[PDB]
Write a protein that binds this DNA or RNA. Structure first.
Length: 1077
RNA sequence: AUUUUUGUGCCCAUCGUUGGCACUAUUAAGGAAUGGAAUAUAG
DNA sequence: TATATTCCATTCCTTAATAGAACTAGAC
DNA sequence: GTCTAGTTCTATTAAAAGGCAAG
């Protein structure tokens, strides 16, 4: 039920005197310089692990003893790392020598793991551990004793303790609790419980715990058995009984005995170290005197990569074993035949160097249809061969040869329409070995080659050091605190200063490197967001109460837009442009405080201070845990449909609904509350622009810009075409340009299209790349309407940034072209620093736009869910589970387009945001068929699927539209289930308009348009509906789109709704029964 | 402990009327793709 | 126009981690 | 009375009696 997350506030360090900042910088430098020593030492400790140390351990995660040892003994690290490198062929030999036995499959798989041979190499950590014993003059027996103790205390191994605990048990010189005393006491409790196994009241249990401890109170029990530290659960029962909060609790005697019996092991030893003094002396020599806070701070940074890579590498090895087991090695000979293509004459290469073959080279499992069509040709050629008896038998055979090449070429072109184009030579080659290999075996064999290569190429994770950051806080860390708001008011009063200010102060216990002693110091920070949502004080009496979600934000119910005073508004106007935005926010904050509109924030020592030093810059982050209790009793489901070009959508469904609109969904009464599109509106004067969909101003208002662009291309409109069947055709760019220069066209589309044309001009004038340099700057940077100056968050705007990056690549590539030394970023920067800076500026702006799009889309989804939660109750947000969208088997353009979907990034932001609000839950569901299901009818109780639809006038019809409708009437079979819906849709289209296949098949687009206009004119209809893949509309049984109009399709009455709105309802309904189980 | 000028960013033919907005930070690798130049091949 | 490779660059996502809790002797 | 710097804390995964006569 308990859920935990953190919210962070980034800040700007406001510097004090240089000497004060130097003291802090020197301390941060000291911790950073120190961290690598702990990293090296912990690697040596891991190297000393052996079968004796891990004897009788836990079950871990199906990790074998061999794997646990191998991951400790051998690691992949940078070649220039201090540990000496080992060859991969020696890992098993070294393992046998250290282990005494040869490695098992898990350790063997780890050794076989792929890695980049030019950056990383295997390292022997056992040799590193030998270096520790030698360098510190440590007894092998003494270090083994300490290592064994460390394993029990979780200082080393699979499940590590915190750095703070590890530092304390290993190096702490403070008074330790006597472990034997706790062992005798826990043992006595176990004995008494066994003696009275049938007790059932806490009163009886507390009495048994008290008798075991020879005491009459928890306080006397703790002093004798657990003097220092957090209260053990067994002593908490006595304390809670003395408080009176657990008197009615149930008692599970077998469970208490079992849990107590498991802790016994930890208390059979007193943790008497034998080499800690020597190791501490070595550490003091390298990082200075032992301090729990400083050593613990450095150890946490050193430990994180070592522990994390061990966890990740163990899972990866186990994953590889299953993936390898999943391979069918029995198909290797079939794979061997297919791989034979490289040796065959069909494949031809200078060095005849091969490549990996994947299913898309044969068109996946669509080779079978090609085989049947090819067998039929052969069958007819093997049945008409008997009726020959002529000298020219070399006619028919050539007709069989030549028609085999058209069938294959045709297959490759058809498949290449909606996927990667298959390889003609490989399929020709494969047809030649038709008696040699069955077609199903060709697929199994090609699959084996591809699947084997993918599994074998997966790389091991190298162990890389961490760039460190240090934590300051109230407890178990370096001492630090944010001055509290009350202390700030008191400090200001005592200083005869203004009651409020815009700065945040921290006090941290820091080491003075000169004296090597601790000193508390004060530092200043600035963060407007922190001040608004947390820090600024609600000084006025009877201020609004603190918000349920503690943060003071608009989503949490605080608008923060109070009426400003004339002196306040003049302060904003009076300030420079660079400070006006922050001044307005500060003035607005002061107004809400004065007007008593600012809600209270409940202060606590809840914010961690993280400091990271890069150069002379300090990055300070304030983060606080946010606690949430799950609310499983959902009243509303919010479905979200993620789209790429089209708008995203949401649909809300009330569960356990009663009333006029209730629908009975498989015994669950539900009501479709509402659906909508996600838009992010920004006000400009009196109009508003949706950041998500705006494509820019029409060219009508950018004539100077277009003419300026048109003038430059004219001087470089000259361009040839290598694709003209021999002699290239010198075509004209300007004809292409005028098409996109229409006054009606959007600026972003025009700008994106112009970059592509400019790329073509440059490709056609390679020797004159330098000439375009000035034009690119005005287009991308300097121009008033340049890409950098104006762009929305619409898909087209993102594509415009992508093409601009490509054009800069083309300018640079052509600029440095020559007929061996590769061209690097250093070369480009020296060649054109301004152009290179421009490419970086585009990258930085695009990343910022992407982050902004994820946050604004996430905000809209969370706001709607919060609105529904306040109205109805707990809300479950459902998103589509989208994965593995980009594939090598698809064309580059599809993968390129698919990259901007951003469904996962938005979903990840929603999941994090959802964790901050009670009554909100987020899950992902299978998106299968969500675009074709008829919501509230499908699965209630029959499967109901329908085609997507397009709506246009007869004039707007295109040849593609005509061909698409005929394609659905083909009646050729498909492995695509959606194909039937489009077929039924096309059948419905002919019936609804009183048509027949011959009215569309073999009819000119002109004839087709007039036929539809005549029907529509008789029916007094402006537009016609036709089934189209990715069609904007869906004919729904229910009114799920607010703007939907009723229509009678094939004698059935349906609502014409936006297809995406229908989809959001469908996403909400996937496995909806499971959400109310 | 006082700096008083800044947490990070998003949108706009008019960059202001107080213009309109939004947001968990960091470390490190891995996975899957894309762009550019050129090469080989192919009907 | 397709396939495939090499080299220089890039994006979007995933998965290992960090951002401790509760306590008391002893220092004020 | 307070505050800090030091300590230990959490999973669950236990064993064996019970079930049978005269002696």
């Amino acid at each position: 039920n308990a859920s935990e997350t953190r919210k962070a506030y980034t800040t700007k360090m406001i510097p004090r005197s240089h000497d004060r900042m130097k003291l802090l910088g020197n301390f941060m430098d000291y911790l950073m310089d120190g961290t690598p020593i702990f990293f090296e030492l912990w690697n040596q400790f891991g190297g000393g692990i052996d079968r004796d140390i891990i004897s009788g351990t836990a079950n871990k995660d199906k990790i074998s003893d061999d794997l646990l040892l191998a991951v400790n003994w051998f690691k992949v690290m940078p070649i220039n790392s201090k540990p000496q490198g080992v060859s991969p062929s020696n890992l098993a030999n070294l393992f046998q020598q250290y282990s005494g036995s040869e490695p098992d499959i898990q350790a063997q798989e780890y050794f076989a793991s792929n890695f980049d041979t030019e950056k990383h190499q295997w390292k022997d950590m056992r040799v590193e551990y030998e270096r520790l014993l030698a360098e510190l003059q440590l007894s092998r027996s003494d270090m083994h004793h300490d290592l064994k103790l460390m394993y029990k205390e979780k200082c080393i191994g699979l499940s590590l303790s915190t750095a703070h605990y590890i530092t304390s048990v290993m190096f702490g010189t403070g008074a330790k609790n006597n472990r034997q005393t706790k062992h005798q006491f826990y043992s006595k409790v176990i004995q008494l419980l066994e003696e009275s196994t049938q007790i059932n009241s806490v009163e009886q249990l507390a009495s048994i715990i008290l008798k075991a401890g020879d005491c009459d109170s928890y306080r006397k029990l703790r002093i004798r058995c657990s003097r220092k530290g957090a209260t053990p659960s067994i002593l908490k029962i006595v304390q809670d009984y003395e408080l009176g909060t657990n008197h009615d609790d149930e008692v599970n005697v077998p469970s208490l005995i079992a849990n107590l019996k498991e802790k016994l092991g930890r208390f059979e030893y007193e943790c008497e170290w034998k080499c800690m003094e020597k190791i501490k002396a070595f550490l003091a020599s390298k990082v200075g005197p032992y301090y729990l806070g400083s050593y613990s701070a450095m150890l946490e940074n050193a430990l994180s990569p070592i522990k994390g890579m061990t966890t990740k590498n163990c899972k990866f090895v186990l994953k590889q074993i299953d993936a390898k087991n999943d391979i069918k090695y029995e198909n290797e000979p079939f794979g061997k035949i297919v791989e034979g293509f490289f040796d065959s004459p069909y494949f031809e290469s200078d060095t005849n160097v091969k490549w990996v073959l994947h299913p898309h080279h044969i068109g996946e499992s669509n080779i079978k249809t090609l085989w049947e069509d090819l067998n039929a040709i052969h069958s007819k050629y093997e049945e008409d061969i008997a009726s020959l008896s002529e000298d020219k038998k070399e006619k028919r055979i050539k007709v069989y040869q030549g028609d085999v090449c058209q069938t294959i070429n045709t297959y490759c072109e058809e498949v290449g329409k909606e996927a990667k184009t298959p390889l003609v030579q490989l399929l020709r080659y494969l047809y030649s070995r038709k008696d040699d290999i069955a077609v199903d075996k060709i697929i199994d064999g090609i699959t084996f080659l591809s699947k084997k290569h993918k599994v074998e190429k997966q790389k091991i994770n190298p162990v890389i050091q961490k760039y460190p950051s240090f934590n300051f806080g109230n407890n178990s860390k370096l001492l630090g605190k944010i001055i509290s708001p009350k202390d700030k008011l008191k400090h200001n009063l005592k200083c005869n200063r203004n009651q409020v200010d815009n700065y945040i102060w921290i006090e941290i216990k820091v080491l003075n490197t000169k004296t090597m002693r601790w000193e508390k110091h004060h530092y200043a920070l600035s963060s407007t967001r922190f001040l608004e949502e947390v820090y600024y004080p609600a000084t006025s009496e009877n201020p609004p109460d603190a918000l349920a979600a503690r943060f003071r934000t608009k989503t949490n119910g605080y608008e923060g837009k109070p009426a400003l005073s004339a002196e306040q508004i003049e302060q904003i106007r009076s300030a420079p442009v660079g400070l006006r935005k922050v001044k307005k926010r500060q003035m607005r904050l002061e107004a809400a405080r004065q007007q008593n509109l600012l809600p209270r924030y409940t202060w606590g020592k809840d914010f961690n201070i993280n400091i990271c030093k890069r150069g002379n810059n300090f990055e300070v982050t304030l983060a606080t845990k946010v606690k949430k209790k799950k609310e499983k009793n959902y009243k509303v489901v919010l479905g979200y449909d993620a789209n790429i070009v089209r708008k995203n959508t949401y649909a809300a469904i009330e569960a356990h609904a009663n009333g006029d609109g209730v629908i009975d969904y498989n015994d669950l009464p539900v009501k479709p509350i509402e659906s909508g599109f996600v838009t992010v509106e920004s006000q400009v004067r009196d109009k508003s622009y949706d950041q998500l969909s705006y494509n820019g101003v029409k060219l009508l208002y950018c004539k100077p810009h277009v003419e300026s662009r048109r003038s430059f291309l004219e001087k470089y409109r000259n361009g040839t075409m290598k694709d003209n069947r021999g002699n290239n055709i010198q075509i004209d760019f300007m004809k292409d340009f005028e098409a996109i220069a229409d006054d009606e066209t959007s600026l972003y589309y025009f700008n994106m299209k112009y970059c592509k044309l400019l790329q073509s001009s440059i490709r056609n004038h390679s020797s004159q790349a330098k000439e375009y340099r000035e034009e690119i700057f005005e287009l991308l940077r300097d121009g008033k309407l340049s890409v950098l100056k104006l762009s929305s968050l619409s898909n087209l705007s993102f594509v415009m940034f992508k093409v601009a990056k490509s054009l800069i690549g083309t300018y640079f590539g052509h600029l440095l072209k020559k007929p061996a030394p590769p061209i690097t970023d250093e070369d480009k920067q020296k060649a054109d620093p301004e152009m290179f800076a421009l490419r970086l500026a585009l990258e930085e702006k695009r990343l910022n736009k992407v982050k902004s799009k994820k946050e604004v889309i996430a905000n809209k989804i969370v706001a709607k869910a919060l609105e529904l939660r306040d109205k109805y109750g707990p809300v479950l947000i459902k998103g589509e589970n989208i994965s593995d969208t980009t594939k090598k088997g698809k064309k580059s353009s599809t993968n390129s387009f698919l990259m901007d979907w951003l469904a996962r990034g938005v979903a990840n932001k929603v999941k994090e945001m959802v964790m901050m609000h009670q009554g909100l839950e987020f899950v992902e569901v299978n998106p299968n068929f969500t675009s074709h299901q008829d919501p509230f009818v499908h699965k209630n109780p029959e499967n109901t699927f329908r085609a997507r639809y397009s709506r246009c006038t007869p004039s707007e019809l295109t040849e593609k539209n005509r061909k698409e409708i005929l394609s659905f009437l083909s009646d050729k079979p498909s492995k695509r289930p959606t194909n039937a819906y489009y077929n039924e849709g096309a059948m419905a289209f002919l019936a609804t308009y009183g048509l027949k296949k011959n009215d569309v098949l073999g009819v000119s687009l002109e004839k087709f348009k007039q036929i539809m206009a005549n029907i529509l004119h008789q029916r007094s209809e402006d537009q016609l509906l036709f089934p189209s893949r990715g069609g904007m509309f869906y004919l729904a049984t229910y009114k799920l789109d607010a703007d939907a109009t009723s229509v009678n399709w094939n004698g059935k009455q349906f609502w014409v709704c936006n297809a995406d709105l229908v989809a959001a309802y469908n996403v909400g309904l996937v496995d909806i029964q499971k959400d109310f189980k």
